[PDB]
Amino acid sequence: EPDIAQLKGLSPSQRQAYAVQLKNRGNHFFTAIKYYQYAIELDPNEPVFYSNISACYISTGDLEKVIEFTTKALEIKPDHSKALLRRASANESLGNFTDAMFDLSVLSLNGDFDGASIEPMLERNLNKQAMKVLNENLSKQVLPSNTSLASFFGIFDSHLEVSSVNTSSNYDTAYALLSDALQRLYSATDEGYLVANDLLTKSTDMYHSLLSANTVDDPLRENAALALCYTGIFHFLKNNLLDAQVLLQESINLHPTPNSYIFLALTLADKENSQEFFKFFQKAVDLNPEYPPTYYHRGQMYFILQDYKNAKEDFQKAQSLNPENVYPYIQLACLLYKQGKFTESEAFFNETKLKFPTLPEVPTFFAEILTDRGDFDTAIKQYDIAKRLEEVQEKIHVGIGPLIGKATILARQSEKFNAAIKLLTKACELDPRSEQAKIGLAQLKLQMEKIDEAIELFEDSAILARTMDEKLQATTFAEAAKIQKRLRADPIISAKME
Ligand SMILES: [Cl-]
Ligand SMILES: [Cl-]
Ligand SMILES: [Cl-]
Ligand SMILES: [Cl-]
Numbered sequence: 001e002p003d004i005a006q007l008k009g010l011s012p013s014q015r016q017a018y019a020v021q022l023k024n025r026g027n028h029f030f031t032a033i034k035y036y037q038y039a040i041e042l043d044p045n046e047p048v049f050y051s052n053i054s055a056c057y058i059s060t061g062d063l064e065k066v067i068e069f070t071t072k073a074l075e076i077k078p079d080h081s082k083a084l085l086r087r088a089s090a091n092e093s094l095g096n097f098t099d100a101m102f103d104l105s106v107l108s109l110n111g112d113f114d115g116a117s118i119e120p121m122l123e124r125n126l127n128k129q130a131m132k133v134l135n136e137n138l139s140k141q142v143l144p145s146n147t148s149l150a151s152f153f154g155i156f157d158s159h160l161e162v163s164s165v166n167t168s169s170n171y172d173t174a175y176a177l178l179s180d181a182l183q184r185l186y187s188a189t190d191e192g193y194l195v196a197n198d199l200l201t202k203s204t205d206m207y208h209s210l211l212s213a214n215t216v217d218d219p220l221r222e223n224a225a226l227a228l229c230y231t232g233i234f235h236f237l238k239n240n241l242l243d244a245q246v247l248l249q250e251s252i253n254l255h256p257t258p259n260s261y262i263f264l265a266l267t268l269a270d271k272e273n274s275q276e277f278f279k280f281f282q283k284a285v286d287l288n289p290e291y292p293p294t295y296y297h298r299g300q301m302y303f304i305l306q307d308y309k310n311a312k313e314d315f316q317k318a319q320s321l322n323p324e325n326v327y328p329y330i331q332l333a334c335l336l337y338k339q340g341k342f343t344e345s346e347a348f349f350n351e352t353k354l355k356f357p358t359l360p361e362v363p364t365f366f367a368e369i370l371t372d373r374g375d376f377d378t379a380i381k382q383y384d385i386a387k388r389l390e391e392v393q394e395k396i397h398v399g400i401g402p403l404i405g406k407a408t409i410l411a412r413q414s415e416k417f418n419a420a421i422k423l424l425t426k427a428c429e430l431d432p433r434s435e436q437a438k439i440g441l442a443q444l445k446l447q448m449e450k451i452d453e454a455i456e457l458f459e460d461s462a463i464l465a466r467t468m469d470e471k472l473q474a475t476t477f478a479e480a481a482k483i484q485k486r487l488r489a490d491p492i493i494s495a496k497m498e
Contacts, residue, residue, distance in 0.1 A: 002022075002038065004038050004042070007042055008041065015043055016042070018042055019039045019040075019049070020043075022035050022036075022038045022042065023035070023036060023046075023048065023049055023052065026038075026052060027052070032052075032056050033053060033056045036053040040053070047072075047073040047077045047083075050069045050070070050072040050076075050083075051080065051083055053065075054069035054073065054083065054086055055086075057069065058090075063090045063093050063094050064094070066086055066087065066089075066090035067087060067091065070083040070087035070090070071087065074087065078106075079110060081112070084103045084104075084106060084107045085103075085107065087099075088103040088104050088107070088121070091103065092121075092124075092125055092128075095128075095132070097128045097129035097132065098129060098479075098482070098483065098486070101122055101126060102483065102486055102487070105487055106487075106493065108122075126476065126479060126480055127476070129479045130475045130476040133475050133478075134468075134472050134475045142238065142433065142463070143193060143194070143234075143237060144237050144466065145399065145400075145431045145433040145434035145435075145437075145464075146193055146396055146431050146433070147396070147399025147400050147431050147434055147436075148399075148434075150395070153185070153186070154325075154361075154397075155296045155297070156293055157292075158186035161185075161186055162179065162182045162186055164226060165178050165182065165223060165226065166219040166220075166222050169219035169223065171210065171213075171215055171216055171220050172210065172217065172219060172220040173210070174207060174210060174223070177199060177203045177206065178199075178203045178207075178223055178227050181195070181196050181199035181230070182196075184196045188395035188397075189396060190396075196234070197238075200227065200231040203227040203231070204227045204228060204231040207224035210224065211224055221255055225255035225257065226255075226257075228250045228251035228254070229247075229257060229259050229260045229263060230259075232244050232245075232246075232247035232248035232250075232260075232263055232267075233248070233263040233266075233267075236263065236266065236267045239466050241267055245264065245267055245268065248264040248267060249264065252264065256287055258284040258285075258287045258288050258294050259293070261281065261283050261284035261287065261294075262280075262281070262284050262293060262297050265277050265281055265297075268280075269301070271301070271304055271305060274301070277301060278298075278301075281297065281301075285298075290321055291321070292321035292322040292328070293318070294318075295315070295317040295318040296314070296315065296318035296328055298314045299311045299312075299313075299314030299315040299318065299328075299331060302314060303334075303335060308339055311331075311335055312332065312335055315328045315331045315332050316328075316332070319332070326352065326361050326362065327361070329348070329355070332348060333345050333348035333349045333366075334369070336348055337369050342369075342373070345369065349362060349366045358393075359389065359397060360385075360386040360387070360389035360393070360397050360398045360402065361397055361398055363385045364382075364386040364398045364401050364405070366382050367379045367383045367386060370382060371409060376409050376413065379405070380406055380409055383402045383406040383409075384406070386398055386401070390402060399430075399434075400427040400430050400431045400434060400437060403423045403424070403426055403427040403430070403437075404427055404434075404436055404437060407420045407424045407440060410423065411424075411440070411443070417444070417447075421441075421444050424437060424440045424444065427440070427441075433464060434464075435464035435465045435470070435474065438457040438458075439457065439458065439474060441457055442454040442458050442477065442481075443477075445457065446481060446484070449488075451481055451485045451488065455478055455481045455482060458478035458481060459475075461474040462474035462475045462478060
């Protein structure tokens, strides 16, 4: 109704004075947008007009307009508390979680606001942003670390496995390759795992071809089942659960074996419903009640489930079937510890050490328990002993586990900080597929303000991580650090961060 174009043609002072009057009218209509817009048309240099309009759009629910006009207020007064809080809210609603965390971060730098009163919204936006990025990445061929692989295959009898290839077929022209793949697998070396993965795939292809012919042997079917079994579990280790189940069932259909059932159970495992897991292991036991790895793997599930009695019996059975394998001893000692029986656990570890004096598995798992007890001094010494034993072994036993355990004690103890960096850097070099090593190193990079390097280690770690929870954890660290990068990139912000 007032003629704004006409008022626009008046002197700056008149326009400024008329604009206050227009804004005043707007404030009344508060009982509005039209009058604030009029005010802005006349004097675009008053943040009050923009902040007032943005309050209108909150009322009307126009989120995009709230962003537009809070931003206009903030261009003039970048620490306008009301505008920062409104823009963060609208941004959170629109799914712009990074922009919400940036404005909430700037807000906290205002000493008028208790950091603790803003942290819950920073945290909520961070978790939303991590889940957004994780889901995007999931929506749009790498092995676990050599340390993890040595651990996974540690229970099996290397010589038994390699010898399980049948040389009596009249049709099997492929078995030398399967024999080679298993020899390389059970070498427990860096080269071994890489080689095993490619050679098991190639073997499986060759068996798929031989099985397609009109003439096939039982010895042949058994070798094909064995290739499929190990290729299946490699799929599982590569986080390809679907192709894992397919090949493992193919294997079982050809020639049911304990390993085939153990590997299938592992692939489909879920502690929150256990029934199928235990049926698969009972069938594995049926196929060979004297096979130690069946009982050991079932004991681990009972352990996870806190069925300590059944876990003890299964580990004892694995132990009695193959007393020369250190793993059932370790788990028995760990079982004692988790039941609050540290003194018995410690005695069991000491007896195990006498039986296996050169194996770093013993001090490594014992150091883990001491760390859990807060006995950081003694844990360091046990990690030191494990590290020295590991370095001199021919095979991988505990891999970089000791370097990680020691660095982690040193890093949070706090001089030693450089010692922690050197340990974790060595660990990353020795076992480049270890997400544990990358994440530990990234945490220290953050503390010395190498944020770009942190981000890269975190993101690489999420791609490496196997479980959804571990992928989400590493994504969360990456997304948090990207916010840090963004804040540090503004020198005014960065000075206030000091
Ligand atoms: Cl007028
Ligand atoms: Cl204005
Ligand atoms: Cl999350
Ligand atoms: Cl080590």
